[PDB]
Amino acid sequence: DNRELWKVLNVDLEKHDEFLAPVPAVYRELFLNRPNRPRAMAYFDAVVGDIHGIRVHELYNLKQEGKKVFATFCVYVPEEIINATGSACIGLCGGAQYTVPAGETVLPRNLCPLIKSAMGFKIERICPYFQVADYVVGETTCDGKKKAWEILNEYIPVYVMELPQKKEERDRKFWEEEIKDFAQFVEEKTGVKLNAENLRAGIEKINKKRKALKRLSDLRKHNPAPIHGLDVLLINQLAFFDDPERFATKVNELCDELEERVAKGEGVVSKDAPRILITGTPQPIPHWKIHALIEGAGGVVVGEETCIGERYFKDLVEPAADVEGMLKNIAARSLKVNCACFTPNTGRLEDILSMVQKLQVDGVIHYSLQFCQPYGVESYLVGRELERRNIPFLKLESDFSEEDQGQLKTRIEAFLEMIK
Amino acid sequence: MDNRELWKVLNVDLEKHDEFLAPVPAVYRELFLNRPNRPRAMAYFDAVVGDIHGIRVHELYNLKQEGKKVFATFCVYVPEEIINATGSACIGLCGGAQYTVPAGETVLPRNLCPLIKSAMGFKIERICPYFQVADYVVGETTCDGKKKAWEILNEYIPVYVMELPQKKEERDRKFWEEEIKDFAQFVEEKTGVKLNAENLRAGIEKINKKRKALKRLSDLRKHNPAPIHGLDVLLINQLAFFDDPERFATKVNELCDELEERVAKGEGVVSKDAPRILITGTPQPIPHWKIHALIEGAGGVVVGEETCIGERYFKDLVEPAADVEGMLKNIAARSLKVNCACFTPNTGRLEDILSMVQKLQVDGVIHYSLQFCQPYGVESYLVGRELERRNIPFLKLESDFSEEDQGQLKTRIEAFLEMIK
Amino acid sequence: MFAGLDLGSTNSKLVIIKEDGSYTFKVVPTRYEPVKAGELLLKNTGEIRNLVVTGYGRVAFNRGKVVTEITCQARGCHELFPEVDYILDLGGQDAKIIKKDGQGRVVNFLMNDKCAAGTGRFLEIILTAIGDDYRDEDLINEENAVPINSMCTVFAESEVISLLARGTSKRAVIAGLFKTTAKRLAKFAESLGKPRKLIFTGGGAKYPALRLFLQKEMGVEVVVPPEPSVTAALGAALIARET
Amino acid sequence: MFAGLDLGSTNSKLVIIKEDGSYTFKVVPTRYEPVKAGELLLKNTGEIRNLVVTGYGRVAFNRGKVVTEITCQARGCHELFPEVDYILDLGGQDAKIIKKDGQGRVVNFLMNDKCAAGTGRFLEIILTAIGDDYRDEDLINEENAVPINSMCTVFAESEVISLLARGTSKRAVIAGLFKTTAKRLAKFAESLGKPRKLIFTGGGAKYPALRLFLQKEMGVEVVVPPEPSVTAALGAALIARET
C-alpha cells in the first residue's frame, strides 16, 4: 500500500506525514465545502485525496518495466519527446512553504519560493514524485533556477537545456539544436529510439491534453461563469502529475457538464460578480491562496495568464511526417510561450489584452512570487499599458506562507470594491 | 561655471546633482586623502575624483561635437575594442550610490540589485553628466534584473541589447561570435565609421594596453609587505571605466613604476603580519568603497579583487589577427573568457580564485555580493564549499549601498580577521 | 445613529453620526484583539441604525456592513477636503496612497509592498526607546539628518543600532528616520500621479516633523485633518448612513 | 581582578574574575546607549587590572582591549563546555553559529544575513504585545501552532497581525513563532557542519520553549549555560586574564 511504496522510495516518512497532515482540512475549506461545484470535479477531488498514492504507484511500476521518470520545472521541456518513448514526464515546481527552510540550507533566502520549496522537497526526501524520478531536466530561464540546477545535481542527475533569451532566427535555430540534443539524451537514457510513429503518438498524446485544457479555458468566457477559477487552477496544476490520457478524458468529461450549464445559463456566481484575469507567475499545487481570496470576496477568476494556465496549453504542435520535422515543430511550439525570461516579451502583453476582451474581464490582477525578478520587473510595463487602455490593474506579490491573508484581502477587496 | 554650464547644456538636474556631490569630498578626504603612505602617483586619480564630472565629461562632449559617439555600458562583455576603433568613446555606468536608489525604484522593484536601481535612478533624475552625455546604452542579457531593466531604460535613451549565451560550449561560442559581428555593424551604423584592419587593430591595442597596465598593477600586489592599499587599487579599477584609455594606461604604468621602487626596498602600506585578503564576487562601482574601507580600517589589506571591477576586467587580452574577421572572432573569445556567475557551470571562476589565493599569498577570502544579486548569491554556496574543502578561510558578506550597517559588517570582518590571525 | 468602526492593526476607532448630522469619535488601542476593542467602543453607544466595519478586524467582527479601509478613507477624507484628490494614509502596518473623485469614490489606490510593511509601528517603537524628550520643532533644521536605509524596518533598525552604538546623536537618528521615511513616502504618494496637493492622514500624520519633511520633499502643500486617527472611521459612518 | 564587558545591542553585561578564579556578573539594558551602560556597570566594582570590551559598543567605549563577540563567546563557552564543538548564540539583533576546536579556538563561524536581523528583539516585542498571561508550560502542549513566515521579522509581523485579526489564539501564534524560530535556527546551526552536540547561549536561550523546540529540531543533545546572558562577557574576562 501507499506507506510501503513511500518506504521503498526512501521518503522521510515522518516529515512527509507532517507535510501532508494539514492538507485535507485546507482542501475541505477551499474546495469540498464550496457549493455548486461540477459533479465532474469528483475525479480531481479524489486525485488530491490520494495525491501521493495511485499516480506514484503507476510511475514506480513504469520504472520496474524499464521506463524512466523525468522531472521538469518549465513548460519549455518537451513532454512530447519523453512520452514518445513511453516514459513519464512530471512537473515538480514547488508550491509549499513547509519545505522552504530546507531549501534555504543551500539557497539564498532572497529567492523565489518556487525554487526553494522544490529544493527542500528533494533534500528532505519529502516528495514521493521527486523520490521516484530518474532525472531532472532543468532549463536556463531565471537566475535562481539556472544556478539551483548546479546544486540540485548533487542529489539527482540534472540535464540542463539552454533556452535562449530572444526569439530571433538565430535563437530559434539554437533552440532547435537544443531540442535535438535533448532527444538524443532521452533516447540514450531510455534505450528507445525515436521514429515517426512513436514521436507522432507522443505529440498526439500531449496535444490531446493541451486541447482538453484549452476547451476548459474557452468555456470560462461564458456569463455567468460556469465554474469557479479555483477549480480550474487545480485542474491545471494536476496536469503536471497525472496520466495524460486519463487526465484528458476527465477534463473532457468536465467540459461536457459545463456545456450543459452554459446551455441553461447556470453559473457559480451572478452575472454582476466581477470577472478577474490573473496574470504573472505559475501557481503550483497547493498554492491556492490568491484564487481563494479573490473568489471568497465574491469575484470569479475566469482565466490565468501563467504557465499553470493559458501559457501551458494554448499552443499545440503542428504535425509533420518525419522525426526531423516533428522535432522542429516541437521546438517551435514551445517558443510560442511568452515568458518574461525573453526580451522583449511584447507578445505576453498582446496575450493579456486579448484575454481581457475574449473573457470580458472587469479587472486584471498581476500576481508574481516574491523575488521573481523576471515577472517582478516586467510588471511595470504591463501595468503601464493596461492603465493607458483603462483596464483596472492590481499588482500583488506574496510567498507560500499562508498567513498574510489580511494584507492580501484588503488589497484584493479594495480593488473589487473599486471596479464594481 | 565651466562645469556647471556644461551640465546645464546636458540637461543635468543641477539642484539634485549638487546634493548628490556635496557629501563626496569629505568621504574621499577621510578614506583616501588623509590616509597615510599612499603612493605619490595616486595624485592623478585623486585629481580625477576631485573633478569627477568635469574634465572627462568635457572631453566626451567635445567628442560628440566632432561627430563621434559616446556608448554607455554596464558589463565587461561589451567590446570596448570595437567602439574605440571608430574613435567613439566607451564608458561604464554601473551604479554605486544610494542617492539614486529611490529614483530607480519608481520603475523597478525595491528588492532588486542596488547596482541596477542606482543606475536607473541616475538617468531618471538626470543626475549623472556621463549618463546625460551618452548617445547610446549597450545592455547585455546577463542577470534577470539587468535584462528586464533595459526594456524600461530604452524609454529614456536608446538601448542596444547584446544577447550573451549562458554556457560556453561550441554552439555558444559561435553564437557569441555572431552577436559580436551584429554589434560591430551597429557601431559602424551609428558612427559612420566602417571598421577595417587598421582601425580595429588600433582599437584592440588601445584597450589591450589599458588591460595590460591594470594586469601589471595587479601582479605587484603579490609582494609582501603589500606596496599599496587595496582601496586605492579599487579606485583605479573603478576609474578605468570613465577615463581616457591612453591617458589612463600611462598613469597606471607610472604608478607601477613607483610601486616597483617600493618593492625594491621592502616598503609597504601595512606590516608584514597584517591579514592579506582576497575579495571575490560582484563589481563594486564608484563610490561603493565600504567593504575595502572596512577591511583595511580593521588592519587588513586587500591584495586582489576577483570581480569585474578588478581581475575579471583585465585578466584576458585580445589576441592578434590579420584581418577584421579574425579580430572580431578574437574580440568575441576574449570576453567569453570572463567567468561570470551568469554562466553555468562557472568552474573557471573557482580555478581563478584558488590561483589568486596562492599567487597573492592570501590568508582569507571575503566573498562580497550585493543584496538581491541572485547569480552570485546562489553560486556563493558552491564556492564557499570548495574553499572549505581546501582549508581556505572564507567569509560571505552581503550589503547594499546604504552606509550605516558598518557596525554589523565590522563585527563580521573583524571576527574573521581575528580567526585568521 | 450611523456608526463606522475602524478596527486597525494598532488603534480601533468609532465614529457615530447623529440625526442632526453631527458626529462623535472615540479611539482605543486595538491590543491585537479587534473584537474586544470594537465591543468596548460600541459600549453604551445607543440604538444604531446602520453599521459599517473596516480595517483588519472587519474580517472577524460578527455584525455590520464590511468595507475596506481604502474605500472608507477616501469617503471620510472627501467629507473634510472635497477639493483635494490625493490621500496618503500612514497606519501602523500599511501605507496607502489613494486618489478619489469629486464624489469621494476611489479612482485608484496603492498600498505598500511586503518589504515596506510596518513603517508606522517601527516609528512608534523606536521613538519610545530613544525617546524624543526633545520637541518636534527641533528636528526640522538638524544639520545632520544622517541617511538611514529606506529598504525596510529590519535594515533601518540595524543602522539605528550601529549609529547609536558609535555615538551618533539621538536627535540626529530621529531626524534621519523621519527624513528617510518622508523621502520614501513622497515617492510613494506620487505613484498615482503628481498631486497638486496632498491629504496626509492616519496616525502617522500626527508626527509634525514627518509632515514637514514630506511636504518639503513633495514640493506641494500637505494638509492634515484636525484628527487624522478617525478619518477612515468617519468614512465608514458616512457609508453606513448612505446605506 | 580581570573584567569582561559585553556592550550588546540589547543588554550590557559585566563579568569580573578574581585571582581565586571565582566570578561575579552584572547585567543592565543597553537602551541604545552602550557607553552609559558600560559606565554604570563598571562603577563601584573596584579597580580592574585588565579589561576586554566586546559587542557593538566596543569601539566607542575607549577602554580596554577590543575583541569581537564571536571570539569572546567561544572563549566563555569553552570554559563551561570544552567537549562541545558548536555554539549557537542568539542575541537581540544578531544570530551566530561558531565552531571551535578542543583548545577553544574559533575554527569557523557564521552570522545571520541582513534579512535575518533582529530576530531576538522581535520575540521580546511580540511577547510583550501579546503579553503572556499564558504559562510557558503551554507552548509545548500546543496542538495547533500556526507556522509563521521565516523570511524576516517584517513578514512575520504582518502575519501575526493577520492571525490575531481573524481570531487566532495568542497561544497558537506564540507557539508558532517559537517553533518557526526554532526550525530556522536549527538549520542555521548546521551551516558549519552538523553538530553531535550543541551549546545554545545568549539571551535567546532564556526562552524555555525556544530551548525545547530547538532541541527537538536539532535531534541531538542541547546544553544551555547556567547564565546564557553572560557567557560572552565571561569569555572577554577570561581573555583579559590571559592577556
Ligand SMILES: Nc1ncnc2c1ncn2[C@@H]1O[C@H](COP(=O)(O)OP(=O)(O)O)[C@@H](O)[C@H]1O
Ligand atoms: N503619540 C503617538 N502615539 C502612538 N502612535 C503615534 C503617535 N503619534 C503618531 N503615531 C503613529 O500612529 C500609528 C497608528 O496609526 P493608526 O492610523 O491608528 O494605525 P492603524 O489604522 O493602522 O491601526 C502608529 O504606528 C504611530 O506610527
Ligand SMILES: Nc1ncnc2c1ncn2[C@@H]1O[C@H](COP(=O)(O)OP(=O)(O)O)[C@@H](O)[C@H]1O
Ligand atoms: N525575560 C526576557 N526579557 C527580555 N529578553 C529576553 C527574555 N528572555 C529571553 N530574552 C531574549 O534575549 C535577547 C537579548 O539577548 P542578549 O544576548 O542580551 O542580546 P545582545 O547580546 O544582542 O545585547 C532579547 O532580544 C530576547 O529575545
Ligand code: SF4
Ligand atoms: S528583511 Fe527587509 S528586505 Fe529582507 S525580505 Fe524582510 S522586509 Fe524585505
Ligand code: ALF
Ligand atoms: F490598520 Al493599519 F495601517 F495597520 F491602518
Ligand code: ALF
Ligand atoms: F549585540 Al547582539 F545579538 F545584537 F549580541
Ligand SMILES: [Mg+2]
Ligand atoms: Mg488605518
Ligand SMILES: [Mg+2]
Ligand atoms: Mg550578544
